[PDB]
Amino acid sequence: MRECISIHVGQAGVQIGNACWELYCLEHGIQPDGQMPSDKTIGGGDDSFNTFFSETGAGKHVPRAVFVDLEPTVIDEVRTGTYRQLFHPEQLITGKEDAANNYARGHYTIGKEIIDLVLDRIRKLADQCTGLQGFLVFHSFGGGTGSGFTSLLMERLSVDYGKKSKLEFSIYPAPQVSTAVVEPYNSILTTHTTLEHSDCAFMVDNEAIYDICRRNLDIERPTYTNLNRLISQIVSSITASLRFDGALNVDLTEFQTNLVPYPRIHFPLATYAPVISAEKAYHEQLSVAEITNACFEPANQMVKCDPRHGKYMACCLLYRGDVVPKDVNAAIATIKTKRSIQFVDWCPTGFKVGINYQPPTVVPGGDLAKVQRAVCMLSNTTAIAEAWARLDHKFDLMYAKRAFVHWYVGEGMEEGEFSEAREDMAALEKDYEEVGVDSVEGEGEEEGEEY
Amino acid sequence: MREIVHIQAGQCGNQIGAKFWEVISDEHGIDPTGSYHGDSDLQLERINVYYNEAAGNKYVPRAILVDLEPGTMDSVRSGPFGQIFRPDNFVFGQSGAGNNWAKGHYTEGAELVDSVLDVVRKESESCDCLQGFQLTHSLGGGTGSGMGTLLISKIREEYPDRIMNTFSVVPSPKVSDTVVEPYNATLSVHQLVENTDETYCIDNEALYDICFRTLKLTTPTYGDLNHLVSATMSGVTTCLRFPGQLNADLRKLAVNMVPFPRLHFFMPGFAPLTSRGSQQYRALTVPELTQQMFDAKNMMAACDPRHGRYLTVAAVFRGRMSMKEVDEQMLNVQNKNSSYFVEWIPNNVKTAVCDIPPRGLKMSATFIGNSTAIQELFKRISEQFTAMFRRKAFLHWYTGEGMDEMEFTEAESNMNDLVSEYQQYQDATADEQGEFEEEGEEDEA
Numbered sequence: 036m037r038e039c040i041s042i043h044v045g046q047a048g049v050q051i052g053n054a055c056w057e058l059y060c061l062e063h064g065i066q067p068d069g070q071m072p073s074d075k076t077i078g079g080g081d082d083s084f085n086t087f088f089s090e091t092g093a094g095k096h097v098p099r100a101v102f103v104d105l106e107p108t109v110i111d112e113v114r115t116g117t118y119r120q121l122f123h124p125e126q127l128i129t130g131k132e133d134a135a136n137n138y139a140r141g142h143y144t145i146g147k148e149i150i151d152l153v154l155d156r157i158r159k160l161a162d163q164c165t166g167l168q169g170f171l172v173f174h175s176f177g178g179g180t181g182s183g184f185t186s187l188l189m190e191r192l193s194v195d196y197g198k199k200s201k202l203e204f205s206i207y208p209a210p211q212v213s214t215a216v217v218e219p220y221n222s223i224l225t226t227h228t229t230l231e232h233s234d235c236a237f238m239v240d241n242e243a244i245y246d247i248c249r250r251n252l253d254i255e256r257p258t259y260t261n262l263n264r265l266i267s268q269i270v271s272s273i274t275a276s277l278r279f280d281g282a283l284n285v286d287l288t289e290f291q292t293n294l295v296p297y298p299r300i301h302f303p304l305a306t307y308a309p310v311i312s313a314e315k316a317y318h319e320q321l322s323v324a325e326i327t328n329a330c331f332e333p334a335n336q337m338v339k340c341d342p343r344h345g346k347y348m349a350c351c352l353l354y355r356g357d358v359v360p361k362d363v364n365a366a367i368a369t370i371k372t373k374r375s376i377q378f379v380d381w382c383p384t385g386f387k388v389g390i391n392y393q394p395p396t397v398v399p400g401g402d403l404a405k406v407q408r409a410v411c412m413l414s415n416t417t418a419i420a421e422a423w424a425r426l427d428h429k430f431d432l433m434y435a436k437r438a439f440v441h442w443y444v445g446e447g448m449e450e451g452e453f454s455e456a457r458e459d460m461a462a463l464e465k466d467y468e469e470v471g472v473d474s475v476e477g478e479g480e481e482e483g484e485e486y
Numbered sequence: 487m488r489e490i491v492h493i494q495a496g497q498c499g500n501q502i503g504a505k506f507w508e509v510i511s512d513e514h515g516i517d518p519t520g521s522y523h524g525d526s527d528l529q530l531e532r533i534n535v536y537y538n539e540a541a542g543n544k545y546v547p548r549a550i551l552v553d554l555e556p557g558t559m560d561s562v563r564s565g566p567f568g569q570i571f572r573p574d575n576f577v578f579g580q581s582g583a584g585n586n587w588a589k590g591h592y593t594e595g596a597e598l599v600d601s602v603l604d605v606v607r608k609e610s611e612s613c614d615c616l617q618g619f620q621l622t623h624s625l626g627g628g629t630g631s632g633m634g635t636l637l638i639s640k641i642r643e644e645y646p647d648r649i650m651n652t653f654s655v656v657p658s659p660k661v662s663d664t665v666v667e668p669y670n671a672t673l674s675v676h677q678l679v680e681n682t683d684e685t686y687c688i689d690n691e692a693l694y695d696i697c698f699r700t701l702k703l704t705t706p707t708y709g710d711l712n713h714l715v716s717a718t719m720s721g722v723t724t725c726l727r728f729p730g731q732l733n734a735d736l737r738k739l740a741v742n743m744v745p746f747p748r749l750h751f752f753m754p755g756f757a758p759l760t761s762r763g764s765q766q767y768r769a770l771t772v773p774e775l776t777q778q779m780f781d782a783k784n785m786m787a788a789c790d791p792r793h794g795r796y797l798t799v800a801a802v803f804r805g806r807m808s809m810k811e812v813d814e815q816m817l818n819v820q821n822k823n824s825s826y827f828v829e830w831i832p833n834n835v836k837t838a839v840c841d842i843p844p845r846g847l848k849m850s851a852t853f854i855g856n857s858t859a860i861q862e863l864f865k866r867i868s869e870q871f872t873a874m875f876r877r878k879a880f881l882h883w884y885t886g887e888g889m890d891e892m893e894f895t896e897a898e899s900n901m902n903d904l905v906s907e908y909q910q911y912q913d914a915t916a917d918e919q920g921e922f923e924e925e926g927e928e929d930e931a
């Protein structure tokens with residue numbers, strides 16, 4: 036019909052997939068062991084969510100999910116957790132040794148020992164999609180398997196299924212926060228390999244989401260369970276049009292056709308709103324304008340570059356729940372009219388708008404805001420060229436001294452691989468500079484009069 | 487005798503279509519069983535124009551549903567009058583058009599459009615005299631744009647002398663809902679311009695403003711916005727189904743609205759339009775109907791007709807009307823507004839009057855005005871299109887389905903040519919045009 040398939044790649048992808056797949060059950064009434072607790076048509080009906088689940092037995096749900104890190108410790112938490120009896124036991128996949136925060140262990144040794152077991156179970160899910168759209172991968176660019184397996188999966192999928200939607204969903208490098216000494220290398224060996232494959236790739240940073248939780252939600256203590264249980268609502272707001280009815284719904288293809296002027300410029304940065312504390316939600320007005328204002332606010336962005344350092348190319352601004360097309364048109368006309376909120380000179384048409392009737396729904400187990408309506412935004416902009424410039428800075432100090440490179444060598448990797456990934460970053464730097472320019476015409480050299 | 491097929495295409499065009507068919511089912515007294523239990527002979531005795539007749543006292547609407555994405559199509563099925571629609575008139579893909587006109591023209595529409603043409607045929611061998619084709623769709627859509635212009639350009643080769651008529655959502659001037667609007671719109675207009683007979687331009691920026699200004703609706707919904715559209719398609723087809731003093735059927739209409747075969751894009755309007763406050767105080771009369779019909783904020787395009795000149799106008803009045811009171815109001819406008827008519831088409835009005843008003847209005851009028859003013863639409867879209875193809879922006883997605891750069895050039899070449907034809911006739915003289923040279927005086931030898 037309209038089927039999607041998610042792959043949860045490495046520790047971050049997995050930790051995220053546990054948040055996501057609480058909410059994908061919870062939206063439909065589906066219980067933590069796949070059960071539909073009450074069904075108006077046992078063996079058909081609505082059930083609009085066969086796009087996210089395959090049905091078995093007497094109306095038990097099996098999800099359309101995959102879990103993989105070469106660490107049992109993070110997958111066994113799926114097979115012994117609160118939801119163990121939801122998922123499929125040959126869809127909680129491991130390997131014999133975890134990837135040490137390294138690329139080459141993925142791409143040329145140990146990921147390369149598990150890729151054909153994974154691609155096979157993916158083939159059995161795919162054949163059971165009557166209307167396969169494509170697949171999403173959830174990762175960190177800074178991850179070990181995150182870098183090393185996504186790359187090797189999308190080298191396989193993009194010529195296994197081809198014209199099918201190729202998506203990524205990525206934890207994207209923090210400006211000042213870090214986790215690992217080896218993140219710049221993991222990121223840049225994956226962009227080299229995988230930016231040739233995704234049609235659109237959707238971006239968030241932990242340093243911004245920590246900010247959202249400390250400011251907007253007014254949480255003193257963001258655990259990763261506090262963080263990821265926000266992100267759930269991002270893909271819940273992206274995926275609504277495939278899960279519920281409405282007025283102006285958006286397939287997984289249309290983000291591509293609209294967010295991407297050029298097929299290297301397909302990394303749009305997310306934000307989602309409203310986000311308030313359980314004190315703030317009782318004094319706010321939370322109308323569509325006021326959401327849409329907070330959606331373009333620089334502090335409020337889910338990748339931590341200020342969009343004002345950039346210029347906007349394109350954007351996608353989907354609305355969910357209590358929302359009205361004239362009221363939305365009014366907020367678009369407002370952000371548009373404030374030209375100070377800056378687009379490129381050449382932009383004829385920069386927007387993609389949507390209406391889905393089902394509201395936002397939270398989780399059990401917080402002091403949380405049960406709002407009536409929400410927006411989910413993705414920004415395409417030269418502001419990502421500020422954080423490319425940071426990867427250009429991080430890389431060159433390490434790689435000149437040739438720090439760490441022997442750990443990648445000894446697990447299957449060329450030296451020319453690093454070099455040719457940074458070469459691609461030398462291109463990307465400029466691929467993003469040949470856009471931020473104004474459309475004015477002319478060439479060569481002159482020093483005299485025409486008049 | 488004379489019967490019309492309608493097609494609905496796009497998630498946009500089927501959501502309009504599904505509610506047009508409610509409004510019409512209301513006008514004819516059809517119950518959501520597909521059964522007539524209305525309230526006048528005529529409603530049943532001219533049901534033929536729109537529905538197939540079926541045994542056991544049933545009518546099936548002669549409308550087809552098309553979208554390459556299954557989503558909204560099922561929303562129409564389990565909604566209002568969804569069960570009167572024929573299951574075998576739903577024709578649906580799996581993948582979508584992706585907002586992409588060339589994925590609709592070349593991939594997922596070529597893969598599906600014959601199976602439709604077959605249903606369109608099965609409908610056409612149900613029509614004793616096939617009138618022609620109505621469409622509702624979106625130009626900013628994928629499927630409505632791309633797979634509809636596939637269908638438009640294929641019908642015309644198969645149905646040569648029948649009319650093929652269109653009610654398009656068109657891009658608006660202030661905002662945009664989809665980024666590839668200028669590509670989709672301009673690739674569309676390329677096909678439409680030479681395979682259709684009418685192009686009713688419908689614009690959400692006006693629809694949203696009519697709902698806010700004239701009906702004092704604080705929060706206009708798409709429910710609201712399709713209603714006006716439905717009551718205007720209603721209007722435009724009233725003279726086949728319902729009698730009166732002057733009947734102006736879809737043939738007769740078109741003859742009086744298209745002066746040359748490419749100048750067939752119109753600004754429709756509905757009258758009256760009045761808030762729940764206003765309805766108490768305004769008198770519902772032929773002169774307040776005429777004034778609201780010319781009222782430059784009340785047209786269904788977000789473009790100001792007073793920027794140009796009417797080539798031609800038509801009106802469809804509905805209810806108990808008085809012929810001198812219609813004609814003299816049509817005359818009073820043309821007298822006080824001489825600057826708003828083109829001077830070499832004389833007396834720029836097509837009148838027509840039906841006996842029978844729309845259900846829940848004591849009297850109404852429909853406007854179909856053909857102005858130069860539509861230059862504005864093609865002026866904005868062809869600069870936005872050169873803004874895109876000059877920089878090959880968004881274009882890899884469509885070439886990536888088997889289109890070539892020659893075609894973008896030919897869609898553009900034609901729209902620029904087309905805006906130059908409407909601007910050739912924007913304010914074109916009734917005074918002679920060109921060749922101003924002469925013979926001299928006789929000379930000594």
Ligand SMILES: Nc1nc2c(ncn2[C@@H]2O[C@H](COP(=O)(O)OP(=O)(O)OP(=O)(O)O)[C@@H](O)[C@H]2O)c(=O)[nH]1
Pocket residue numbers: 044045046047050051104105106133134135136137175176177178179180181182206214215218241259262263
């Ligand atoms: N948002 C978020 N990021 C996470 C989470 N877990 C870790 N990270 C990030 O993801 C990366 C760490 O993952 P890794 O430890 O490299 O996990 P892996 O990909 O499986 O690599 P190996 O375990 O060595 O196979 C760093 O860039 C972290 O900032 C999580 O649950 N949420």
Ligand SMILES: Nc1nc2c(ncn2[C@@H]2O[C@H](COP(=O)(O)OP(=O)(O)O)[C@@H](O)[C@H]2O)c(=O)[nH]1
Pocket residue numbers: 282283284495496497498499501502553555583584585624626627628629630631655663664690708711712
């Ligand atoms: N006026 C009107 N326009 C609509 C409605 N729903 C969608 N649209 C518009 O149609 C476009 C959406 O395109 P869509 O139908 O999704 O593409 P398609 O399915 O590929 O043909 C946008 O311009 C929307 O504003 C509706 O009910 N009424």
Ligand SMILES: [Mg+2]
Pocket residue numbers: 045046104105106133134135179180
């Ligand atoms: Mg791991």
